Amino acid sequence: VIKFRAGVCEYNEDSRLCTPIPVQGEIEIKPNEEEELGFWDFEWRPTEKPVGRELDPISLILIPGETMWVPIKSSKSGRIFALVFSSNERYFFWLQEKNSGNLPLNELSAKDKEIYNKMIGVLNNSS
Amino acid sequence: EVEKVATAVLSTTARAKARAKKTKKEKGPNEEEKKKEHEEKEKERETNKKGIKETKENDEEFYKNKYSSKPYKVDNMTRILPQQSRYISFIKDDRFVPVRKFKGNNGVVVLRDREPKEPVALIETVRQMKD
Numbered sequence A: 001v002i003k004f005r006a007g008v009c010e011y012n013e014d015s016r017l018c019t020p021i022p023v024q025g026e027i028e029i030k031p032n033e034e035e036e037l038g039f040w041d042f043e044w045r046p047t048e049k050p051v052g053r054e055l056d057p058i059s060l061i062l063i064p065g066e067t068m069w070v071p072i073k074s075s076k077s078g079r080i081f082a083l084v085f086s087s088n089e090r091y092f093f094w095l096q097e098k099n100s101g102n103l104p105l106n107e108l109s110a111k112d113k114e115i116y117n118k119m120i121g122v123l124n125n126s127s
Numbered sequence B: 001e002v003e004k005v006a007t008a009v010l011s012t013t014a015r016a017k018a019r020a021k022k023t024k025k026e027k028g029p030n031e032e033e034k035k036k037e038h039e040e041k042e043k044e045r046e047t048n049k050k051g052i053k054e055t056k057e058n059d060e061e062f063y064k065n066k067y068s069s070k071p072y073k074v075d076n077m078t079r080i081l082p083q084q085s086r087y088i089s090f091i092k093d094d095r096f097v098p099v100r101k102f103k104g105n106n107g108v109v110v111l112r113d114r115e116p117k118e119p120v121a122l123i124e125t126v127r128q129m130k131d
Helices: A112-124 B002-015 B017-033 B126-130
Strands: A002-009 A024-030 A041-048 A058-060 A092-095 B096-098 B111-113
Touching: A002 A041, B002 B017
Parallel strands: none
Antiparallel strands: A002 A024, A002 A092, A024 A041, A041 A058, B096 B111
């Protein structure tokens, strides 16, 4: 199980604005093993900061071929953790992890290699 | 420990001397006739090496200048005794040039960077490492 500090972030189909509504919480990834698709559960939890749209916890399953990873999405903010579902289960997270700070930074985190490896492992692969 | 065993070897050879003057005449040929140890020069022997652990500083010869007048390069982030600080001048060859004049004293000094868009390594504070 891989945890890092993350916030909730808004999703849009309008123009794909994708700027964080900042909070503070975590994402906690269970890699799972259930069937051939893996179904890795991304459970988001708030721990402080009700300000904005808090988003009560919801676990989101990884369905492969509908979800997608791109580190930016409109180059307003980097670190766009993407679970694409086209307004079904679509809720976004924005890593807020400490690697040079919790800041927005383009092409994900400052520890560049570290975090690309995680994305391929969780998102693209199926257990 | 080193001196104990260096003194050991040397003293034994000295004692043997008086017998040795006449021995040494027979010894020369018997090496050519029979065999030699691993060298064919003389007979040369062991000497032993002594233990010296400390590399001491001498003292100055010039007290009139203890700071010469010649150039020397002094790196940023180093021990800076107040005598040096007077002759520190920031060089233009670098991007980095002082905002005002330099005080001639040690301290936190802020510089104007003409090209901050070019990669230079930077030195992380303690606080940075922990993030």
